[PDB]
Amino acid sequence: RGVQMLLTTVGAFAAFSLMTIAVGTDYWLYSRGVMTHSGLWRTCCLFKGLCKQIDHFPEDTAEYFLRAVRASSIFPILSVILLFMGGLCIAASEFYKTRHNIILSAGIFFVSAGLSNIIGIIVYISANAYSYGWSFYFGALSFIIAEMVGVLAVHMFIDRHKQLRATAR
Amino acid sequence: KADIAIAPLTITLVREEVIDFSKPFMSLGISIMIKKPQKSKPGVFSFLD
Numbered sequence: 743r744g745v746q747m748l749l750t751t752v753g754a755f756a757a758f759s760l761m762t763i764a765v766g767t768d769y770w771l772y773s774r775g776v777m778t779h780s781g782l783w784r785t786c787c788l789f790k791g792l793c794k795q796i797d798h799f800p801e802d803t804a805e806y807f808l809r810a811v812r813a814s815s816i817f818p819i820l821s822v823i824l825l826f827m828g829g830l831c832i833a834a835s836e837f838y839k840t841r842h843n844i845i846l847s848a849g850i851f852f853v854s855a856g857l858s859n860i861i862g863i864i865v866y867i868s869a870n871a872y873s874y875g876w877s878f879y880f881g882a883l884s885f886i887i888a889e890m891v892g893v894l895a896v897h898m899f900i901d902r903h904k905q906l907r908a909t910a911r
Numbered sequence: 912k913a914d915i916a917i918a919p920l921t922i923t924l925v926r927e928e929v930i931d932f933s934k935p936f937m938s939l940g941i942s943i944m945i946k947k948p949q950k951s952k953p954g955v956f957s958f959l960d
């Protein structure tokens with residue numbers, strides 16, 4: 743009962759924290775002219791110690807569209823905003839459960855936020871064209887925890903719907 | 912100031928009017944200079960290329 747809900751809540755909280763850490767720094771690694779890390783906003787070298795915003799969008803129209811999407815991180819920022827909205831919806835549905843159908847829309851928004859985060863990871867992997875950062879693996883692990891939390895949330899929702907259907911008869 | 916010029920000087924009519932010229936040793940023309948076409952990132956068009 744409450745154990746699965748608390749596990750889903752701490753999984754959503756850990757996924758939001760790892761998404762924030764993926765937004766922050768150390769997302770990728772690229773050897774410049776010496777190694778240098780990047781966190782999709784600015785690059786920092788391994789002289790040594792200086793940091794600057796190296797997310798310059800200039801140096802068919804599909805290349806300009808892909809460069810515009812890769813600039814300023816349109817997909818993962820909106821994905822993190824949708825994850826925060828899903829966490830707020832799960833917190834509003836945890837206490838005073840009046841309507842028994844908002845959890846389905848919250849889970850649908852949570853799965854769509856996970857799919858958008860995976861799509862943004864695909865965009866950031868495509869725009870990379872030599873190693874990888876740790877925040878990329880942290881964002882992948884947060885995507886795994888988000889998928890498992892969505893499965894647990896829809897499992898609790900179908901269990902609550904089956905309990906309501908059994909209590910209605 | 913000179914005796915003979917052995918250099919790539921363009922044979923024109925206005926230069927014929929003052930000095931003389933021999934038969935051409937190498938013919939040429941105006942050509943097109945472009946870069947060598949290297950590999951470009953194809954993108955979404957590779958789904959049904």
Ligand SMILES: O=c1[nH]c2cc(C(F)(F)F)c(N3CCOCC3)cc2n(CP(=O)(O)O)c1=O
Pocket residue numbers: 919920921922
């Ligand atoms: O007598 C002329 N002989 C010329 C000989 C040459 C070359 F031999 F190739 F060096 C060139 N270049 C073209 C290519 O790049 C470098 C310079 C220009 C010449 N021009 C100027 P034009 O009037 O624009 O032809 C003459 O007048």
